[PDB]
């Protein structure tokens, strides 16, 4: 676990409907909910390949399990029963454990993606913004929709607002 989901970020947003991970901004123009398309798309590709790897790795040949034996062949019937029960037990154990462990792999993957998004935004903003907990940043400068979109796609231009942020911070 990485501490983002059910961690320093408490709960999810029912408002964000276009993706798994994303931002919620609040400016003078208004607030919103935008999903991070790059991280969400990477997660979608990974989860799709995991599901496909689980499904398509099972290949079988045409077989018929059922067999019939007479009364004088009971060692036959018992051996057939043994092979059938053994295969069923092995497959049941394997399937249950595989699902159990892959659920933890998927949830950890989502937690890591959220934390990585948080760290990316933090490294972009540097000291131009303050961390106020809950995965939430407060800007020392004045941002419009261009600034918010710039933070979102990954082209923030810290030097543009460095001076104003310094003036507002040291006050």
């Amino acid at each position: 676990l990485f501490g983002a989901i059910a961690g320093f970020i408490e709960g999810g947003w029912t408002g964000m409907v276009d993706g798994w991970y994303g931002y919620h901004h609040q400016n003078e123009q208004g607030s919103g909910y935008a999903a991070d398309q790059k991280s969400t798309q990477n997660a979608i590709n990974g989860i799709t390949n995991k599901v496909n790897s689980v499904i398509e790795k099972m290949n079988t040949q045409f077989t018929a399990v059922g067999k019939e034996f007479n009364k004088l062949e009971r060692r036959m019937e018992n051996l057939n029963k043994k092979v059938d029960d053994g295969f069923i037990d092995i497959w049941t154990y394997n399937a249950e454990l595989l699902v159990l462990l892959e659920n933890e792999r998927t949830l950890d993957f989502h937690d890591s993606n959220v934390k990585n998004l948080y760290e990316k935004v933090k490294s972009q903003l540097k000291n131009n913004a303050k961390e106020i907990g809950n995965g939430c940043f407060e800007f020392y400068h004045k941002c419009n929709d261009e600034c918010m979109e710039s933070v979102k796609n990954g082209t923030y231009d810290y030097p543009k607002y460095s001076e104003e942020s310094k003036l507002n911070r040291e006050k």
Partner: antibody, heavy 127, light 108 residues
Framework: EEKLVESGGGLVQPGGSLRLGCVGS????????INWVRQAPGKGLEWLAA????????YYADSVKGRFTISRDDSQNTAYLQMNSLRTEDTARYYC????????????????????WGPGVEVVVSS | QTVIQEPAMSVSPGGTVTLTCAFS?????????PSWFQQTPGQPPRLLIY???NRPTGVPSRFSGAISGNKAALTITGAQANDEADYYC??????????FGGGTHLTV
């Protein structure tokens, strides 16, 4: 039966205004990004505007920035493109597209996939 | 800035085409997510390949897409004479900002 139907259009003198409307049925409209594209007679497609869900943002092509505005009402499954100060080259067939392809691993709609298109609405700007 | 395409192409039935799409700029990458569109006159455009490799459910397994060198490429193999339509390419320069191509008028 996913469907988008355009509304509005007609003849407007240069310098006028319009509000094209696109109404969607058969899918969760509020979860789909909405694009407005245009096609002039005998000319290629030209992407004009896009609006995201839950106030994510509005994206405009540089050709129509400032003149055209995009908006959406999720309680009526409607998307509005309001055009102000139309020039004479703005005459075209206007389409509303939506990203409305589903995936098996999520309930979202696929990114970078404008699959659901409307029939279009004619806009003629002449004297 | 601007997306360059081929003004017109022709192909015989049962033959493959290589409808290409590029920028009037540097190389085209898979991060631009090209998407192709087939439009017949009087009809809305149809999505054929998205994200340069992926086909919707309805699209026949005949239109393939790839990034050949520095230009996106759409290949049609069967050419069943219903492919006589205008083929457009869109390249994404942002999250939702996309530029459409001029159009390749394919005749079979």
């Amino acid at each position: 039966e996913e469907k988008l139907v355009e509304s509005g259009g007609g003849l407007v003198q240069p310098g006028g205004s319009l509000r094209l409307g696109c109404v969607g049925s058969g899918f969760t409209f509020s979860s789909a990004y909405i694009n407005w594209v245009r096609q002039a007679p005998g000319k290629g497609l030209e992407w004009l505007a896009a609006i995201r869900t839950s106030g994510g943002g509005t994206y405009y092509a540089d050709s129509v920035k400032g003149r055209f505005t995009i908006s959406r009402d999720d309680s009526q499954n409607t998307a509005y493109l309001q055009m102000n100060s139309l020039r004479t080259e703005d005459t075209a067939r206007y389409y509303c597209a939506a990203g409305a392809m589903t995936m098996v691993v999520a309930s979202f709609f696929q990114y970078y996939a404008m699959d659901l298109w409307g029939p279009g609405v004619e806009v003629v700007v002449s004297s | 800035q601007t997306v360059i395409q081929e003004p017109a192409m022709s192909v015989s039935p049962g033959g493959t085409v290589t409808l290409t799409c590029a920028f009037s700029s540097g190389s085209v990458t898979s991060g631009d997510y090209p998407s192709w569109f087939q439009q017949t006159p009087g009809q809305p455009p149809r999505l054929l390949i998205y994200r340069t490799n992926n086909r919707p459910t309805g699209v026949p397994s005949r239109f393939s897409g790839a990034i050949s060198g520095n230009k996106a490429a759409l290949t049609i193999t069967g050419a069943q004479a219903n492919d006589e339509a205008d083929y457009y390419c869109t390249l994404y320069t942002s999250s939702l900002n996309n530029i459409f191509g001029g159009g390749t008028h394919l005749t079979v």
